[PDB]
Amino acid sequence: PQVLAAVIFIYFAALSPAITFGGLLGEKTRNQMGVSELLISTAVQGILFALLGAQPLLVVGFSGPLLVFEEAFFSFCETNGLEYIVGRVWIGFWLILLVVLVVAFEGSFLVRFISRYTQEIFSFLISLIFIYETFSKLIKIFQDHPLQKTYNYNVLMVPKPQGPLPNTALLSLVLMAGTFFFAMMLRKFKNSSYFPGKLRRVIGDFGVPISILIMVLVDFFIQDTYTQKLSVPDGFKVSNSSARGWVIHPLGLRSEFPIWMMFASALPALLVFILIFLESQITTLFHLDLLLVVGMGGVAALFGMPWLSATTIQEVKEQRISGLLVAVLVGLSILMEPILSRIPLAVLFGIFLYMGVTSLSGIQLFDRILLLFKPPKYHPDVPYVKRVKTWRMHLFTGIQIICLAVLWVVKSTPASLALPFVLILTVPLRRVLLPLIFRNVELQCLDADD
Amino acid sequence: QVLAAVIFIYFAALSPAITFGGLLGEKTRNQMGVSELLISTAVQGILFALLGAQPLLVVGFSGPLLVFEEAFFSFCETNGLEYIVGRVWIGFWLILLVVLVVAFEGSFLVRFISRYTQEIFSFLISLIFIYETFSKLIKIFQDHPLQKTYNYNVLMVPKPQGPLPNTALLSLVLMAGTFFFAMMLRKFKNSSYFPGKLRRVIGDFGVPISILIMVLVDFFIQDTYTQKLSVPDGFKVSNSSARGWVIHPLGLRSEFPIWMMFASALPALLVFILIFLESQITTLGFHLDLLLVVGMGGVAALFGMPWLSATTVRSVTQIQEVKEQRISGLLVAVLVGLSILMEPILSRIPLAVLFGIFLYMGVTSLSGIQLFDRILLLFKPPKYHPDVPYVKRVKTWRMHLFTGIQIICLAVLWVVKSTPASLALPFVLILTVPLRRVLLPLIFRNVELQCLDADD
Ligand SMILES: *[C@@H]1O[C@H](CO)[C@@H](O)[C@H](O)[C@H]1NC(C)=O
Numbered sequence A: 001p002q003v004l005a006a007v008i009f010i011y012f013a014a015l016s017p018a019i020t021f022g023g024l025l026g027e028k029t030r031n032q033m034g035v036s037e038l039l040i041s042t043a044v045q046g047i048l049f050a051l052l053g054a055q056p057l058l059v060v061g062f063s064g065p066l067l068v069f070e071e072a073f074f075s076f077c078e079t080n081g082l083e084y085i086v087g088r089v090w091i092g093f094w095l096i097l098l099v100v101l102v103v104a105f106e107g108s109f110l111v112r113f114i115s116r117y118t119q120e121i122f123s124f125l126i127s128l129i130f131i132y133e134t135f136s137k138l139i140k141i142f143q144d145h146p147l148q149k150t151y152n153y154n155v156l157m158v159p160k161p162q163g164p165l166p167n168t169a170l171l172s173l174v175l176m177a178g179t180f181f182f183a184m185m186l187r188k189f190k191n192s193s194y195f196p197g198k199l200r201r202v203i204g205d206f207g208v209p210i211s212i213l214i215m216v217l218v219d220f221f222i223q224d225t226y227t228q229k230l231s232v233p234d235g236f237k238v239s240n241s242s243a244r245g246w247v248i249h250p251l252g253l254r255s256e257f258p259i260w261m262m263f264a265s266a267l268p269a270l271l272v273f274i275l276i277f278l279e280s281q282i283t284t285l286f287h288l289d290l291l292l293v294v295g296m297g298g299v300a301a302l303f304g305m306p307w308l309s310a311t312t313i314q315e316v317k318e319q320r321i322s323g324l325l326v327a328v329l330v331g332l333s334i335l336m337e338p339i340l341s342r343i344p345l346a347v348l349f350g351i352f353l354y355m356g357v358t359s360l361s362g363i364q365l366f367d368r369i370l371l372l373f374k375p376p377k378y379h380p381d382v383p384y385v386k387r388v389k390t391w392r393m394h395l396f397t398g399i400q401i402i403c404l405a406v407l408w409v410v411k412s413t414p415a416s417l418a419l420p421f422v423l424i425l426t427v428p429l430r431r432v433l434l435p436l437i438f439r440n441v442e443l444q445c446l447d448a449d450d
Numbered sequence B: 001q002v003l004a005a006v007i008f009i010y011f012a013a014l015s016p017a018i019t020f021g022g023l024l025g026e027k028t029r030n031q032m033g034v035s036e037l038l039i040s041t042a043v044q045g046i047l048f049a050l051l052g053a054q055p056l057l058v059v060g061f062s063g064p065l066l067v068f069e070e071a072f073f074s075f076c077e078t079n080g081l082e083y084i085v086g087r088v089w090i091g092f093w094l095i096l097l098v099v100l101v102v103a104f105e106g107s108f109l110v111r112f113i114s115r116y117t118q119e120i121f122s123f124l125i126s127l128i129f130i131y132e133t134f135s136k137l138i139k140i141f142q143d144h145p146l147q148k149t150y151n152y153n154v155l156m157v158p159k160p161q162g163p164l165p166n167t168a169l170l171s172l173v174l175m176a177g178t179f180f181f182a183m184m185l186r187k188f189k190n191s192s193y194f195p196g197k198l199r200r201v202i203g204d205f206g207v208p209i210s211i212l213i214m215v216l217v218d219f220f221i222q223d224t225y226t227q228k229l230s231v232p233d234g235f236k237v238s239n240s241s242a243r244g245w246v247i248h249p250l251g252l253r254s255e256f257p258i259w260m261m262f263a264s265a266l267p268a269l270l271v272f273i274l275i276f277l278e279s280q281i282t283t284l285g286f287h288l289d290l291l292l293v294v295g296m297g298g299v300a301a302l303f304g305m306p307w308l309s310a311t312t313v314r315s316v317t318q319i320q321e322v323k324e325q326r327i328s329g330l331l332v333a334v335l336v337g338l339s340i341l342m343e344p345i346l347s348r349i350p351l352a353v354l355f356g357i358f359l360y361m362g363v364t365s366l367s368g369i370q371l372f373d374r375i376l377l378l379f380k381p382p383k384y385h386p387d388v389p390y391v392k393r394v395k396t397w398r399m400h401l402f403t404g405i406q407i408i409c410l411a412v413l414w415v416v417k418s419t420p421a422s423l424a425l426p427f428v429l430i431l432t433v434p435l436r437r438v439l440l441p442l443i444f445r446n447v448e449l450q451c452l453d454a455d456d
């Protein structure tokens, strides 16, 4: 019936970010976790959340802040020479213990402390992170394969290209730009009125898969030029079988895990809990769902799969069946390796840039930043223009920009693990320091929770 | 002040001039190139500023003239003829037509051109621009294919004699970047950002800014080859071995046949039709300006420079005011003439940037086209049509049939252009004038014809 038709849209909207994030994770973590592990985690946790989750509307999947934390912890472990996949196991153990502690007491008291200020700053930071990662990957591609006059005839291609290649960088840039352009034009077409309504909504729903298909075909019919493709195992296998297996031994894989890190892995668990709580506040709003999500993440850390987040009677059962089918098909997607291996990473990074740009649409901070470059009489009819003065609004925006810059600097420094703590430090900034400068009347308008 | 006011119209008359000169050099095998077009534009600009009745009309080369030059070049290369020498007799017949117009006025032919023919002509020119841009891109990709292995011992003295590693992809990137930067600057012009003065200032110079950005982007890329614009050293012919300055009638290399010297009146009629119709689009007293332009073109054909047409150009887009316009036109024409001395700047401009500007002009010429609007309405549902008179008073399928007949006319014109008998393209265009006047009243009633084909 229509259930199988509704399954397809959820499947594609849950698969394209899944494969994109799997590629990004494989690049950042030296392929220690890749597309296969993320797909297996998404499938298993989706099945469990569909069978026994409180709110079926929540889809459990990987996200940007989790990727940033994984990159930061990988950098920390490679700086201190630690077993990263084994440290994640103790992170999961401490997350489970924190889940038990939250269950014992009441965790709904801290929900109301998060306001629009922190959420908007967090989303803007995530969008900037996406854009920066896309452009950094483009710069690395152009650095690895420079535009030279003469290239070597026969370079080794078994692990990867060992030298510069003629058309790799320019074609990668073309593929990224074309993917982004087609996705944006399909989004713009979705809100237009150029075809019949059913066709318009259908094509706009599948804009990302259509753009991906177009650009993969474009690179497919180009024969002799090399582009970096997605690394997918043929079966239900670990990406890097040389580094890790399936069950990660908590007492070290190669060398013995130190006791000091075994006891100090509670602080990274606190950071993970803060990140998941903030993204749930952004999306979900529920302590049962948080219970389930963090518990499944802690359990999956033991088997090497990553933790995820809650990104967003008969009808409830229909949602149960829909979620179960989407999770099962996401799990079976790893068996479709001949298709996934032909997808260039340039298309995936174009989709990454598209997501980063389109996450800025509903951001009031982004609109208020755009108001910096307009004359004062072009401001829209929003309550934070007529009720507050222009320079007060600009000062509010400047303080938010200063907070964003401090967060970016903290991310850049080697102490990038403490980014969730610095991010959550903005809550007492709004509750304590902002009332000193601004007035209450200005603050309710600039920080309205509607 | 005038010294700052002339700069905008200078750039808006120079960028299409260099683009058309490069493209004419490509299609014409450098019989006429950037040097000839620039010299013709300067001389005719001076002579039209000093003697023109209406100074607001700028004199310059355009798309229909380029299509006519292509068609005549193909006709001359098909037969045994010198292409540069037939243009001399075309100019002679044009001067004779100018002499024969002052006797019996042609003001009665002005009323016969309506919105139908003008809109069809503009749409055809836009499609021609887009097709030429994409054909050049396809030829670039064919000359330098994406291969696994390239031979790096290739001679580059006349041109690259073999495929190059990454020329085609960089050319495509440059074309796309130029087009997108020009479109984004146009969109910024009609926006609400920045102080208003600056918005109009940067929006006015969107094309020069996009050209500068992309030329710099290509300039800082060192080891990659891109095809650059061919500009001579100074006041020199583009191809010195071909024609020279004073091209000799009655044959340069071989004997020019008498039958062609007598039958060159038909191409003169076709080019006069093209110039007259483009001047009609420009307008929407005038006899003096039109005949002066045609006479200057006929005289310039004697020295090898191309003929030009008239276009409406304003400053934003009594005796003192007309005198200031005189001085402005003279200064702009003199500076366009002096622009040929900037070889180190003009030779570093890639042709990909100019073709991006060509695509930009082709796309942006479609903005005020009512035929384009009704083509866009072919896809919208009937409830989304705007409140224009040709929708409220005209049934939906009636105007769809009107647009379909116009599309059929456009397809016939395209087939004629692709046909080797492409010289007769303007005449077929004139066939759209009786079609509105004779056959359309048989199908549509008078009310729907007045609504769809509105005078203004
Ligand atoms: C797998 O892990 C080993 C050890 O960390 C590493 O050397 C290798 O590069 C990894 N594989 C890939 C494909 O990166």
Ligand SMILES: *[C@@H]1O[C@H](CO)[C@@H](O)[C@H](O)[C@H]1NC(C)=O
Residues within 6 Å of the ligand: B029, B030, B239, B241, B242
């Ligand atoms: C100049 O003309 C000759 C003969 O027509 C032609 O072979 C040559 O290619 C032309 N020069 C250029 C630069 O095209």
